[PDB]
Amino acid sequence: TRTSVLADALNAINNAEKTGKRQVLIRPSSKVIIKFLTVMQKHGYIGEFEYIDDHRSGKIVVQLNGRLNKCGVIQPRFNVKINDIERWTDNLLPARQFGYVILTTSAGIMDHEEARRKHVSGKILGFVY
Amino acid sequence: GQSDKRELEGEVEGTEDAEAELEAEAEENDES
Amino acid sequence: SLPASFDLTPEDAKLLLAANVHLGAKNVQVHNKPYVYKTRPDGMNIINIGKTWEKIVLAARIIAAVPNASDVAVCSSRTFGQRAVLKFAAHTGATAIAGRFTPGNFTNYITRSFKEPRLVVVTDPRTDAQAIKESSYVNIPVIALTDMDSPSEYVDVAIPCNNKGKHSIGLIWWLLAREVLRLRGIIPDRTTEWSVMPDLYFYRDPEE
Amino acid sequence: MRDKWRKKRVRRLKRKRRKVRARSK
Amino acid sequence: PKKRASNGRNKKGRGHVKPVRCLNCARCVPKDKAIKRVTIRNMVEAAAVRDLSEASVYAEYALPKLYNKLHYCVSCAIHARIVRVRSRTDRKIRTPP
Amino acid sequence: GKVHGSLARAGKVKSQTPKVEKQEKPKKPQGRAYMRLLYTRRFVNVTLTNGKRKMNPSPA
Amino acid sequence: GRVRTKTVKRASKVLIERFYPKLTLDFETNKRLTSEIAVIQSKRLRNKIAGYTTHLMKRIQKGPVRGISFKLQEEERERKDQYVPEVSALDLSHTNGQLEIDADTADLVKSLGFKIPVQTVSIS
Amino acid sequence: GKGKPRGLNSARKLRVHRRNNRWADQAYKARLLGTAFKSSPFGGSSHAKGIVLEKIGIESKQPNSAIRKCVRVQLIKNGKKVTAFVPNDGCLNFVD
Amino acid sequence: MENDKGQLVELYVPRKCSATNRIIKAKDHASVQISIAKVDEDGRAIAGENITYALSGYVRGRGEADDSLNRLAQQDGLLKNVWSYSR
Amino acid sequence: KGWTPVTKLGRLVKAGKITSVEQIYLHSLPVKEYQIIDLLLPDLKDDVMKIRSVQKQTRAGQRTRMKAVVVIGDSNGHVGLGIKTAKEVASAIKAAIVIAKLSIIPIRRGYWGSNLGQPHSLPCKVTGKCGSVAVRLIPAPRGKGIVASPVVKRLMQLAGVEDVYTSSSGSTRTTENTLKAAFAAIGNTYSFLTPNLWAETPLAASPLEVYAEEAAA
RNA sequence: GAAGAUGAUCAGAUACCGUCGUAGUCUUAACCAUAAACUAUGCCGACUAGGGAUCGGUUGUUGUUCUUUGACGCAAUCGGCACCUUACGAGAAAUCAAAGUCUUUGGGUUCUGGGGGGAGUAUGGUCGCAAGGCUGAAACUUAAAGGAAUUGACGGAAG
Ligand SMILES: [Mg+2]
Ligand SMILES: [Mg+2]
Ligand SMILES: [Mg+2]
Ligand SMILES: [Mg+2]
Ligand SMILES: [Mg+2]
Ligand SMILES: [Mg+2]
Ligand SMILES: [Mg+2]
Ligand SMILES: [Mg+2]
Ligand SMILES: [Mg+2]
Ligand SMILES: [Mg+2]
Ligand SMILES: [Mg+2]
Ligand SMILES: [Mg+2]
Ligand SMILES: [Mg+2]
Ligand SMILES: [Mg+2]
Ligand SMILES: [Mg+2]
Ligand SMILES: [Mg+2]
Ligand SMILES: [Mg+2]
Ligand SMILES: [Zn+2]
């Protein structure tokens, strides 16, 4: 069955961006999906996205701009301490100067750079660059 | 031999012969 | 945008339908779907010739941007189109390639007729497959006259028309020559009647 | 030799082994 | 390696097909794998079709045909030249000659 | 493997190798001096034969 | 058989592309010309070259030959295929004066801002 | 999903499955079975003393043809009998 | 990319595909550069003055270049009602 | 003696119209004349990385030919790789150098961490594959040199990379596939979109367009 | 038609071929639990590409034949058994719409392998009336064994 809706959302985004499509349909939606896309949208990796209410889990249409190299989930959502963030950014990101590891912390969903600024850590959720 | 081994060294060894023969024919004749 | 004088005039539309240009193949690929208006009950697909006209105007504007007229290559392997491309080259100064295309003409630089065209224009993607493939090796853009079954791979500008018609091929080539010369200023304006008749550019059997 | 016949040879020889051990049961 | 994508038969979405005996050597062969030819031949050879019509007591009597469906195994058919070895790319062609 | 055989031929070649005494050659320098000797021999007076460089050229 | 070889077939057709105006349809005249045009090592090859060159010349007068491109066959052909009838066969004069397009195509014509008379034809 | 569990609470399955599968490494098997301790003539030692029983000599394998000159040695520590090669040109004459 | 002092240490800022925004590599020989002439109000082509688009060999390989030009040219006014956003 | 260009690109290089290889790369122009590379990169150093003997069985016996692998570069961001087969090694090496020049690509040097000084490393992690061999290049700090096998290290040095980590997978002893994978990997640096390359750049006219008359005939 | 017996063939032929032929083959009650038990390809979920056919269901619609309803034809769709093209992508290749979305490495989950032999052997356990099934080593030995493809050679294979 469907065990991770964030993985389904990112898989659709990856396949559409690699094939040059500028839009993708995601089903189902969720708060984590919307907040994962919002983090991606904030850093310019995606454009405007639209939530469609169908009196169900929902659907999303995302506008792609061709700047996305890869977005993905980390399953399971491993617990990450602050001293472990350096090891995770080295393994997942292409360089030390760009790219972001997305975490879910009790202070909210944020990139690893914002996480260092507010000195918080949670569970790893994915990455994007 | 497996490798080309000296393949050209035989030719570079070949080349002083032409310079030696142009020079050899250039001498005696000059003083012939 | 574009002056209204560039709109499809009723006169050209009469030519296109009488030359059976609007008849597209029975089976249409997904990439040519925007060009189909509706399917005719026998099975033929009706080409939105309004879109055909604009691609013709767009194609002529790309052709006019190439500096050396000889650097533009017009191709036709079908016998119905061989006469059209030879006359197009004569009128515009382009380089015609009628009949067989020698493999290696664009990549092998020691061949006899080794060319470096800045642009390749194709009558039919199916019967001129060899010319299109080599253009994707030396950075050559491709303009193609496409039917509903014509492949659209490595085709930048598709002119929706009937590729398998004796009269369809000649008209599109005649129309391009007139428009290309109009942009160059040879034809004073878009209303002056051209001396050349669309009958020229039509294939003639050995009978005559 | 053939794998099928090698198995048959061993099955017949295992058969012999089983009979031989039963003497000292 | 795998030589044919169809494994020499016509079995897809199926477990078992009952066998048939080859006409030539009586080998048991599955029905989908067998090389099948439909033959409709004239019952009388062309040399004898005239004199038998003159000797016929019936004016305008049509000679019946001989209908037969032949089943061959792989060894018999190859041996009897019913099918022949084709090139690697020509094997894929499955339209009737 | 069938294992056996006469043991009478043990040491045949070493026994019949003609004994040759080592010439009482000058000692070679030791320590820091020897590293000095190798360095010059390979980077100061180069003996290359037009791109053909050999450490121990046999006389040929 | 009397199949000429490649050393005579390609060498003879170079002569036509190079000396067509001076050639002719007579072997005897052709035989003398190639003794001053080409350096042929043997007499037998000279006659062989001229004998196939004459055959090619006899074939050019009957139409265009494959492999020979010179400088007057094609220059004459570009304006040779200029035939055009006085009626355009595409001009709407062969019909009654209006298109015979099918009714389905007529809907597309109606969609554009054009008023062209039509006699709809329903092949069905 | 690569055919192995990935869940955060499936650590026991990962640890046991890996523990089960290291037995396919023969180097690992010999370390835990103590095969050198049980089966090896040296008992896991690097060296072993013994008494020379006889000078015999072993014929080399194809395509080589020679008499490899060895000895039969009975180990002092456990009494096991092994065959030991005698290296160099003529060192069999040093062993009695 | 530039260094700390601000000098552009980057050589060869590459071109990008107009349809998919992918970087067109130095050896992408299936990539083309379309040049389209500007037209004055008399219907005449303006000399040496063009609208330029670039397509990667990937877009051309999928056969989507033609539909992409229909879209790209229509947004720039080079075409009217030939490409439809909604299918 | 005496080089007559046979291509439009060669004529534009024979005249002083095109003076650097980056103008070639901006329009992805195919290079077919090695004299273009010699003129624009006069100071090139080559290295014959491997020589192998291949044999073709015939009715009587083997017909042996020589295969040469050549790596070319200027140690300042440009590198090429060539493999050519000929009966003799000397002709095989000489011809492999020619096609190594024709395939020369630019690389992007970047900074690991701070951008102090000139670029010394790669701007991102890159990977290339040929056959079963996969070569991975990781940006490295300024201290570590080329952490690679001698085969891969030589390709990096001729490209001008100072600082890089390497990890390879597959049958790395297949030398041709390892170098081809690394050449593809080192060339993917100008294929990886980084945020500093997000800015849209205008499409300049091709040099083959502005100098049409010098390339005519 | 195993076994067995027999006529041939062959140097020998216990066999291939021919003739007889017992178990078996079929069926009822029980056992057995293995097959190249094959798609040599675990299952669930999502996505990525076009096309023509076909089976089952549903929904809109005929220059067709028919009772005096049913058939056929054209479109959509869901699901299937398959098939054709391409290769964004994968692979050592043969090849694959999955064997893709895998150093740009993490959707959930079950089982299995770790050079070749010795070996599915010995032993213990357990199931079975038996044949046998399931579980399952070690000593020792060895530099190769193996997969796909290429050239050639050969072939009592075809043209
Ligand atoms: Mg870094
Ligand atoms: Mg960082
Ligand atoms: Mg290509
Ligand atoms: Mg086989
Ligand atoms: Mg089923
Ligand atoms: Mg079965
Ligand atoms: Mg049949
Ligand atoms: Mg001849
Ligand atoms: Mg072992
Ligand atoms: Mg060669
Ligand atoms: Mg890329
Ligand atoms: Mg018997
Ligand atoms: Mg049971
Ligand atoms: Mg499997
Ligand atoms: Mg790693
Ligand atoms: Mg045993
Ligand atoms: Mg094999
Ligand atoms: Zn049979």
CB atoms under 10 Å from CB of F16, counted, come to 7
Nearest to J189 by CA among J139, J118, J130: J139
Nucleotides of K under 7 A from a protein CB: 39-52, 63, 80-84, 88, 91-96, 100-115, 119-123, 131-132, 138-140, 143, 147-149, 151-153, 157-159
Do chains C and J meet with 3 or more Cβ pairs nearer than 8 Å? yes
Q: In what order do the strands lie in the sheet with J126-130?
A: J126-130, J133-139, J164-169, J146-147
Extract the annotated binding site of H for Mg(2+): 31
For tokens 């956003």, the residue is: I85
Length in residues, chain D: 25
Q: Dihedral sign, CA of I36, I41, I47, I49?
A: negative
Residues A107 and E50: their CA atoms lie apart, in Å, by: 104
Identify the residues numbered 29 to 68 in chain H whose C-beta atom is closer than 7 Å to any atom of strand K. 29-30, 33, 35, 39-41, 61
Is residue G118 within 8 angstroms of chain C, CB to CB?
A: no
Q: In what order do the strands lie in the sheet with H81-85?
A: H50-55, H70-75, H81-85
What value, to the nearest 5°, has the Cα angle with vertex H77 and ends H76 and H82? 65
CB atoms under 10 Å from CB of G79, counted, come to 8
Is residue H55 within 8 angstroms of chain F, CB to CB?
A: yes
Residues J190 and A26: their CA atoms lie apart, in Å, by: 31
What's the token pair of residue J66?
């020589």
- Counting Cα atoms < 13 Å in the Cβ hemisphere of I64 gives 17
Resolution in A: 3.5
Is residue A76 within 8 angstroms of chain H, CB to CB?
A: yes
Is residue B2 within 8 angstroms of chain J, CB to CB?
A: yes
Distance of CA J197 to the CA centre of its chain: 22
- Specify the nucleotide whose C1' lies closest to residue A78 (CA): K106
Q: Cβ distance J14 to J46 under 8 Å?
A: no
Q: Residue J78 Cα, ligand 1 centroid: separation in angstroms? A: 22
Q: Cβ distance G73 to G66 under 8 Å?
A: no
CB atoms under 10 Å from CB of G121, counted, come to 13
Q: Three-class SS of residue C75? A: strand
Nearest to J154 by CA among J174, J185, J182: J182
Residues C61 and I46: their CA atoms lie apart, in Å, by: 10
Q: Cβ distance A16 to A99 under 8 Å?
A: no
In chain J, residues with a C-beta closer than 8 Å to the C-beta of I15 are 26-27, 201, 203
Length in residues, chain J: 217
CB atoms under 10 Å from CB of H25, counted, come to 10
Do chains A and D meet with 3 or more Cβ pairs nearer than 8 Å? no
Reading phi first (left if > 0) and then psi (alpha if -120 to 50, else beta), residue A44 is in left
Q: Cβ distance I26 to J106 under 8 Å?
A: yes
What value, to the nearest 5°, has the Cα angle with vertex J151 and ends J22 and A95? 60
Nearest to I22 by CA among J191, G39, A5: J191
Residues J39 and J41: their CA atoms lie apart, in Å, by: 6
Q: How far is CA C36 from CA C29, C44, E55, in A?
A: 10, 10, 69
Separation in Å: K140 C1' and F13 CA:
35
Burial (CB < 10 A; 0-12, 13-18, 19+), residue G9, is middle
In chain A, residues with a C-beta closer than 8 Å to the C-beta of H8 are 76-78
Q: What is the SS3 string spanning chain J?
A: CCCCCCCHHHHHHHCCCCCCHHHHHHCCCCCCCHHHHHHHCCCCEEEEEEEEEEEEECCCCEEEEEEEEEEEECCCCEEEEEEEEECCHHHHHHHHHHHHHHCCEECCCECCCCCCCCCCECCCCEEEEECCEEEEEEECCCCCCEECCHHHHHHHHHHCCCCEEEEEECCCCCHHHHHHHHHHHHHHHHHCCCHHHCCCCCCCCCHHHHCCCCCCC
Q: How far is CA D14 from CA C109, D1, D8, F5, H33, in A?
A: 76, 18, 10, 40, 29
CB atoms under 10 Å from CB of C49, counted, come to 24
Is residue A77 within 8 angstroms of chain H, CB to CB?
A: yes
| Dihedrals phi, psi of H32, to nearest 5 degrees | -85, -35
Residue of I13, I27, I29 lying closest to J201 (CB–CB): I13
Residue of G88, G89, G105 lying closest to C22 (CB–CB): G105
Q: Three-class SS of residue C124? A: coil
Q: Cβ distance C190 to C40 under 8 Å?
A: no
Mind giving me the DSSP string for A23-82?
EEEESS--HHHHHHHHHHHHTTSS--EEEE--SSS-EEEEE--S----EEE-SS--B--G
